[PDB]
């Protein structure tokens, strides 16, 4: 039976391939060739944030486009005031091996976690003024690779056990488990309307998950190796992924196909982080060459570079309003461009 | 009148920065160790000799060591291995001797040594279950490592008294199998410190203390151009 089920799966895969080919009347590169290029983009470092001792693994902008949370391998979260370069909080962690962090959309909570397989949620606004652990979420069997906040009482996480999860913070229990990946899940991205999210994994694939049902809606392939970063397009009908094959790809959720490939002959390093600008015209990606390339998302040309780090550039983000880009690397420095 | 908030923020920075300076003092004086090993490796025994990750702290002669043992992580190491790329050393525990587990250990040592992020991390290598190797050999290696049939013990070997020369050949052959990889790939940035340990041996902690010392010393000597 096992061989007949494998043949059935291959037949369904062939049907999917044919259905996708049927819709490929034209490529993106054949439509946008009449669109003026963005030109040369020359961002400059405006502020550099110092205070971390170990390599920075995660950074996330708050919803006010003014505060940052960052996590190093020392076991310390720092809240920063991007405008005045001042620090706001410096949270010690139970364990130093933290791989992700997230800033709540309300600004009330900070989440983090890593190799301890536990997502720690810190309450930044307490009556005593001290930052305390409000919840420790446990149940994932692998390392925690990414955390995202839907609301103050709901967090979406991903781990190294090939499973994503939806957690109810107040009760501390897991409510939805998203399975179907075969490799570690590396990065999550939430839709602007936080009804869907997309999950990249160490399988050269990505999945579109429906938050409320727990079902996987689409599976996207096209990358050759492990996917390290994923980011929803501002519109919400597309996402960009980066992988270890030194390629970035734009996928469209409505055509269920790869839409554009961002690559260059001189890039043989992986893409640690991916993010879009407010308008979606620029795509920013961090690499292992200790820099960041700015791509024209509609043309796949390089618009500019962001140089100023001396070790691997692990994280990257853009403010909701769009005034600045923040990056962090393994040299323990967070730099802000504009 | 809004200046009072900026002043408050500066006060916050003063408090945070002072705490960070104290933490930096603790951080740089602490030596972090990653503990890896084979499925039958006595990693638990090594921890005893004194969630998703376990932490053990040691103070040896007023020097603080922080040893991390990989807990219930998935067997796919290629993603969380990158995290431990700035530890003082990686402690890799291999049991000597049903699959060819030793070849798996060699393939893992090979993968860890040649990693693009671990090129500046030394490896302290423990070869365990020496008495089981001794009993098995004196009672077969050629069925996994044919070149063992032509291997001879190095003249500068220092075996323990009472050992059967065939056991010394097996031990040094395995050590050499690891060292050939270590020497072939290394470019003076990191070194392997293989050791032959027993299931019960308290000297292991000293073996670690001294190996870490040697690592830091030769690192600095490399920086001063004296080595």
């Amino acid at each position, epitope marked *: 039976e096992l061989d007949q089920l494998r043949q059935e799966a291959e037949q369904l895969k062939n049907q999917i391939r044919d259905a996708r080919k049927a819709c490929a009347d034209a490529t993106l590169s054949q439509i946008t060739n009449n669109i003026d290029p963005v030109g040369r983009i020359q961002m400059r470092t405006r502020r550099t944030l110092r205070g971390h001792l170990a390599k920075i693994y995660a950074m996330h902008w708050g919803t006010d486009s003014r505060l940052l949370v960052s996590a190093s391998q020392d076991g310390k979260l720092i809240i920063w005031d991007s405008y005045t370069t001042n620090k706001v909080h410096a949270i010690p962690l139970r364990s130093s091996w933290v791989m992700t962090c997230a800033y709540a959309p309300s600004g009330n909570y900070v989440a983090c976690g890593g190799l301890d397989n536990i997502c720690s949620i810190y309450n930044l606004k307490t009556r005593e003024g001290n930052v305390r652990v409000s919840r420790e979420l446990a149940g994932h069997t692998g390392y925690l690779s990414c955390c995202r906040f839907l609301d103050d009482n709901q967090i979406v996480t991903s781990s190294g056990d090939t499973t994503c999860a939806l957690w109810d913070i107040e009760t501390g229990q897991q409510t939805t488990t998203f399975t179907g990946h*075969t490799g570690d899940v590396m990065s999550l991205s939430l839709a602007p309307d936080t009804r869907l999210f997309v999950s990249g994994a160490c*399988d050269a694939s990505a999945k579109l998950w429906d938050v409320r049902e727990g079902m996987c809606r689409q599976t996207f*392939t096209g990358h050759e190796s492990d996917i390290n970063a994923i980011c929803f397009f501002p519109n919400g009908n597309a996402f960009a992924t980066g992988s270890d094959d*030194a390629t970035c790809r734009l996928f469209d959720l409505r055509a269920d196909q790869e839409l554009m490939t961002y690559s260059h002959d001189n890039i043989i390093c992986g893409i640690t982080s991916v993010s879009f600008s407010k308008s979606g015209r620029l795509l920013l990606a961090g690499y292992d060459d200790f820099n960041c390339n700015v791509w024209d998302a509609l043309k796949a040309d390089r618009a500019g570079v962001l140089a100023g780090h001396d070790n691997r550039v692990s994280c990257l983000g853009v403010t909701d309003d769009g005034m600045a880009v923040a990056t962090g690397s393994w040299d323990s420095f967070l730099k802000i461009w504009n | 009148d809004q200046r009072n908030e900026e002043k408050a923020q500066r006060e916050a920075n003063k408090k945070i920065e002072k705490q960070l300076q104290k933490d930096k003092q603790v951080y740089r004086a602490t030596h972090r160790l990653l503990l890896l090993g084979a499925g039958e490796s006595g990693k638990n025994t090594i921890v005893k000799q004194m969630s998703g990750i376990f932490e053990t702290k040691f103070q040896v002669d007023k020097v603080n060591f922080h040893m991390f043992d990989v807990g219930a992580q998935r*067997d796919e*190491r290629r993603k969380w291995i990158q995290c431990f790329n700035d530890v003082t050393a990686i402690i890799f525990v291999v049991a000597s001797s049903q699959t060819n587990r030793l070849q798996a250990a060699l*393939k893992l040592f090979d993968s860890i040594w040649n990693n*693009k992020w671990l090129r500046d991390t030394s490896v302290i290598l423990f070869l365990n279950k020496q008495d089981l190797l001794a009993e098995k050999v004196l009672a077969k290696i050629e069925d996994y490592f044919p070149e063992f049939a032509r291997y001879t013990t190095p003249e500068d070997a220092t075996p323990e008294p009472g050992e059967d020369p065939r056991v010394t050949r097996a031990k040094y052959f395995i050590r050499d199998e690891f060292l050939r990889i270590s020497t072939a790939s290394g470019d003076g940035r990191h070194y392997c410190y293989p050791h032959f340990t027993c299931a019960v041996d308290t000297e292991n902690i000293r073996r670690v203390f001294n190996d870490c010392r040697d690592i830091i010393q030769r690192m600095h000597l490399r920086q001063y151009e004296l080595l």
Partner: nanobody
Framework: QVQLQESGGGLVQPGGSLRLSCAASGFTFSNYKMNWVRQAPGKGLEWVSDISQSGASISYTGSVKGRFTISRDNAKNTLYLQMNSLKPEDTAVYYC?????????????????????RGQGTQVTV
């Protein structure tokens, strides 16, 4: 999407020989190291052979040296395995496996848990 499909299996008597193959799709074959691994009927996956991107460096487990050879063809994206002088100990499911990251000298790909860049395997009974 990336696929590895092994072929050339079957049953032979001790002392016989087989030629195994592996067809790759969905990735640039010449940029990755390739491996052969075996799954014994009652034992966990074991690494067998490792050929570099160019074929300039070939490694074998000691139990197969002098009996097995491997090669690759970058113009066809095909990985082979010549299995000579076979013994009963060689009965196993053989899988074609690719190291996870391109231009890398280190790879973790003999994991018991589902490895993404591995084929379905072919049964080689001796």
């Amino acid at each position: 999407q990336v696929q590895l499909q092994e072929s050339g299996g079957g049953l032979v008597q001790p002392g016989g020989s087989l030629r195994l193959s592996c067809a790759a799709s969905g990735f640039t074959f010449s940029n990755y190291k390739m491996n052969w691994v075996r799954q014994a009927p009652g034992k966990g996956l074991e690494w067998v052979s490792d050929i570099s991107q160019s074929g300039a460096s070939i490694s074998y487990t000691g139990s197969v040296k002098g009996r097995f050879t491997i090669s690759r063809d970058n113009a066809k994206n095909t990985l082979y395995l010549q299995m000579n002088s076979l013994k009963p100990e060689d009965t196993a499911v053989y899988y074609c496996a690719r190291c996870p990251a391109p231009f890398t000298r280190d790879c973790f790909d003999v994991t018991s848990t589902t490895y993404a860049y591995r084929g379905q395997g072919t049964q080689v009974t001796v």
